[PDB]
Design an enzyme around this catalytic site. Structure first.
Site: not given
Ligand SMILES: COCCCNc1nc(Cl)c(-c2nc3ccccc3s2)c(N[C@@H]2C[C@H](CO)[C@@H](O)[C@H]2O)n1
Length: 286
Positions: A142, A160
């Site tokens: 991501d 993240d």
């Protein structure tokens, strides 16, 4: 590496019972489905990520700790601690005062535009964080500007790791990521660090142009397609350089674009590995 065992009620108290409003007028956002709240504890500002299937939600929390326990670097956000005793699961990080590269590229809330000099340093810093993850056999899954946080001195910190996968080419049914940044094979279900390189090339195009990866009211709607208009000699990268910069010379901008071009190869095997990307960005400054 070991982390602080924070209580749910200490985190609930310092974040004002997990308030949904912004700082003006906690809430910040949610990159991998978990509302990030601002908090202050032990004379230090923090960011609390409350998670938010019941087991898949817990697997997002367990991976983050497993990956950050192993992964310690200056170009990755630091996890200070977490909380399991509460109903929901919380992850405490060191607070990043300059927010995300997305919000700084868009000048959200009136911040000054980042100069070319800071932009090169952020590109180099982001590429060290990916190199450390790949060296340590991890795939981010991501890589985007909203997931590149900036500290007190505009140092790029990758964040993240809810979708992070070990490597140490695999296939999957549950395809996850951010469409506008994903590579062809990632969208099909393949898991490989070669996809993280593609997504990083989209981030370099946002850095150069200052345009977000996807803009619904724009032609083309996707930033990666601008590369094809430049390859057809219809336009040049010079025509897409962010006009909110006064210190950007053509040689270094073209040099960054060359890296973004190579990163954006649709044929996963033609893309350069992060260590080559890191060398080219270092050679650019230099
Ligand atoms: C007032 O100044 C503003 C500074 C805000 N600073 C800040 N600081 C940290 Cl440490 C995070 C973390 N977010 C996450 C998310 C997942 C895992 C770790 C972390 S650490 C964050 N996330 C927000 C959510 C979004 C990401 O998509 C970004 O655009 C941010 O707005 N924003």
């Amino acid at each position: 590496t070991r982390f602080h065992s924070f209580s749910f009620y200490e985190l609930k108290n310092v974040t004002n019972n997990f308030d949904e409003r912004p700082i003006s007028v906690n809430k910040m956002g949610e990159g991998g489905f978990g509302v990030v709240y601002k908090g202050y504890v032990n004379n230090t500002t923090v960011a609390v990520k409350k998670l938010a299937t019941t087991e898949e939600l817990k697997q997002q929390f367990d991976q983050e700790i497993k990956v950050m326990a192993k992964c310690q670097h200056e170009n990755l956000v630091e996890l200070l601690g977490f909380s399991s005793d509460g109903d929901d699961l919380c992850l405490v990080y060191v607070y990043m005062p300059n927010g995300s590269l997305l919000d700084r590229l868009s000048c959200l809330d009136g911040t000054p535009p980042l100069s070319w000099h800071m932009r090169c340093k952020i590109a180099q810093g982001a590429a060290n964080g990916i190199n450390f993850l790949h060296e340590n056999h991890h795939i981010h899954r991501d890589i985007k500007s909203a997931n590149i946080l900036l500290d007190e001195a505009f140092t790029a910190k990758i964040s993240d790791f809810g979708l992070a996968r070990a490597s140490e080419t695999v296939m999957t049914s549950r395809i996850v990521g951010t469409t506008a940044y994903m590579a062809p094979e990632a969208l099909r279900g393949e898991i490989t660090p070669k996809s993280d390189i593609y997504s990083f090339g989209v981030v370099l195009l946002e850095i150069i142009t200052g345009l977000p990866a996807v803009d619904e009211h724009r032609e083309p709607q996707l930033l990666l397609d601008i590369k094809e208009e430049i390859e057809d000699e219809e336009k040049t990268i010079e025509d897409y350089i962010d006009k909110k910069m006064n210190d950007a010379d053509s040689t270094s901008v073209e040099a960054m674009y060359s890296v973004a071009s190579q990163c954006l190869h649709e044929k996963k095997n033609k893309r350069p590995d992060i260590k080559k990307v890191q060398q080219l960005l270092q050679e650019m400054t230099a």
